[PDB]
Amino acid sequence: TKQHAFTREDLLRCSRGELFGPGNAQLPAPNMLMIDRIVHISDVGGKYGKGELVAELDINPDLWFFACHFEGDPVMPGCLGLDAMWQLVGFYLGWQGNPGRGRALGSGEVKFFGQVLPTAKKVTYNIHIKRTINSLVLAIADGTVSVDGREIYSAEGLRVGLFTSTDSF
Amino acid sequence: TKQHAFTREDLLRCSRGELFGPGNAQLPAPNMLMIDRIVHISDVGGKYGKGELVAELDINPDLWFFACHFEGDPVMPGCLGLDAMWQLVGFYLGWQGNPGRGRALGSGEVKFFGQVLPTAKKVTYNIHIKRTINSLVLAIADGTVSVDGREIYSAEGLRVGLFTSTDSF
Ligand SMILES: CCc1ccc(S(N)(=O)=O)cc1
Ligand SMILES: CCc1ccc(S(N)(=O)=O)cc1
């Protein structure tokens, strides 16, 4: 609950398990990491009064996914923008001090109504925590993805849980 | 509608635009390609009588996503299994002979209730086409992801569209 913004170096330390500690929530390392900075995190406010994250990803034409997705038709995979929203809900649970490894549990409705081209400058994730539940610790959230000011994706009911050292599916 | 099974080499040709032709549906190239083979495709049968795909991904411990997702806690990203299901609905539309580039438009409910560990042998995608619509050509489908016989993910209302040479969001 202490730090309210995170640099790329903080997120890389998070990917190594060195932000929240071993066995606690981790962000992916490159090349699955789809966040450069967390600009804002709070446990109050947001759309539901249960907290909020704002995060950013810098875009340049040399990002790996543009070359393979698709050849002659470069576009950021929608699945990776959706993934960033799950990863941020996991980061939220770890930031609150809960123990365990993050797992995405699913989502209600996802809509893609725009795309991230290699000319774009910045993707912004807005995450609104809707509820946190305690057999598992889990969070439910809504999220949007925007590119250069324009909303392009929405997700309702993102669900992420934490799995202690004994938890399996 | 001609070939009913596809090898990895066919899917790589598809990723180059050389299966359905330039400007038509493409699978991603490595490292976003999450399918090794299409074992079965039909435009009849399936759960809704509007067609079916069965596809497979071989798992081994050296797949790139295990090293970065997560360090000390390797698990196939759920977003990439979900992505394979969108990519197969796109492949279906191209296989029917429709023109245009594929874009995922979203999904109804997604559930993850299992995980793909680096000890697993094979992921299987089962896609049931629910409806195809003609301003855009689009398909709606349900899908499951299974690992070594065990169902682990479900998606209802996967939605994929085709964008001609003039189409934007
Ligand atoms: C070719 C169909 C298609 C197109 C784009 C995606 S995306 N952008 O990975 O979610 C998935 C599937
Ligand atoms: C750490 C939270 C988390 C855990 C796993 C995923 S997944 N497997 O990329 O969909 C996403 C987010």
Amino acid letter, residue A7: T
Report the helix count and the strand count for chain B, using DSSP H and E: 3, 7
β-bridge partners, B142:
B128
B28 Cβ under 8 Å from any chain A Cβ: yes
Omega within 30 of 0 (cis) for the link into B70: yes
| Contact check, Cβ <8 Å, A29/B115 | no
Q: Using an 8 Å Cβ cutoff, are B122 and B96 in contact?
A: no
Q: What is the three-state SS of B31-95?
A: CCCCCCEEEEEECCCCCCCCCEEEEEEECCCCCHHHHHCCCCCCCCCHHHHHHHHHHHHHHHHHH
Q: Determine, for residues A70 and B105 on separate chains, whether the beta-carbon distance falls below 8 Å.
A: no
> What distance, in Å, lies between the first and last C-alpha atoms of chain A?
29
Structure tokens at A24: 């606690």
Q: For ligand 2, pick from B71, B73, B79 the residue to mutate: most ligand atoms within 8 Å of CB.
A: B79
User: CB neighbours of B38 closer than 8 A, spacing ≥ 6?
Assistant: B5, B6, B10, B11, B53, B54, B55, B88, B91
The residues that bridge with A132 in the sheet, in sequence order, are A139
- Could you tell me if A144 lies within 8 Å of chain B, comparing CB atoms? no
- Neighbour-count burial for B69-82, b at 16+ CB within 10 Å, e otherwise: bbbebbbbbbbbbb
Other C-beta atoms lying within 10 Å of the C-beta of residue B115:
20
* Residues of A with a known catalytic role: 69
Dihedral in degrees, nearest 10, Cα atoms A118, B89, B134, B26: 40
**Minimum-distance CB partner of A82 among B72, B75, B79:** B79
Residue B108 to residues A144, A159, B46, B142, Cα–Cα distance (Å): 16, 14, 19, 9
Counting from 1 in the atom list of ligand 1, the atom nearest the Cα of A112 is: 10
Does the beta carbon of A90 lie under 8 angstroms from any beta carbon of chain B?
A: no
Residue with tokens 């429709």: B98
CA-atom Rg of chain A in angstroms: 15
Q: How far is the CA of B95 from the centre of ligand 2 (A)?
A: 32
CA dihedral in degrees (B61, B65, B71, B73; nearest 10)?
-60
- C-alpha closest to that of B82 among B125, B36, B121, B40: B125
**For an interface test with B, which of A66, A69, A153 has the most B Cβ atoms less than 10 Å from its Cβ?**
A69
3-state secondary structure of A54: strand
Burial of A126 (0-12, 13-18, 19+ CB in 10 A): buried
Contact assessment for residue B158 and residue B128, using Cβ atoms and an 8 Å cutoff: no
Rounded distance from Cα A41 to ligand 1 centre (Å): 30
Q: Does A109 touch chain B (CB under 8 A)?
A: yes
Q: Resolution of this PDB entry, in A?
A: 1.9
Task: Compute the Cα dihedral for B101, B105, B109, B113 and give only its sign.
Answer: positive
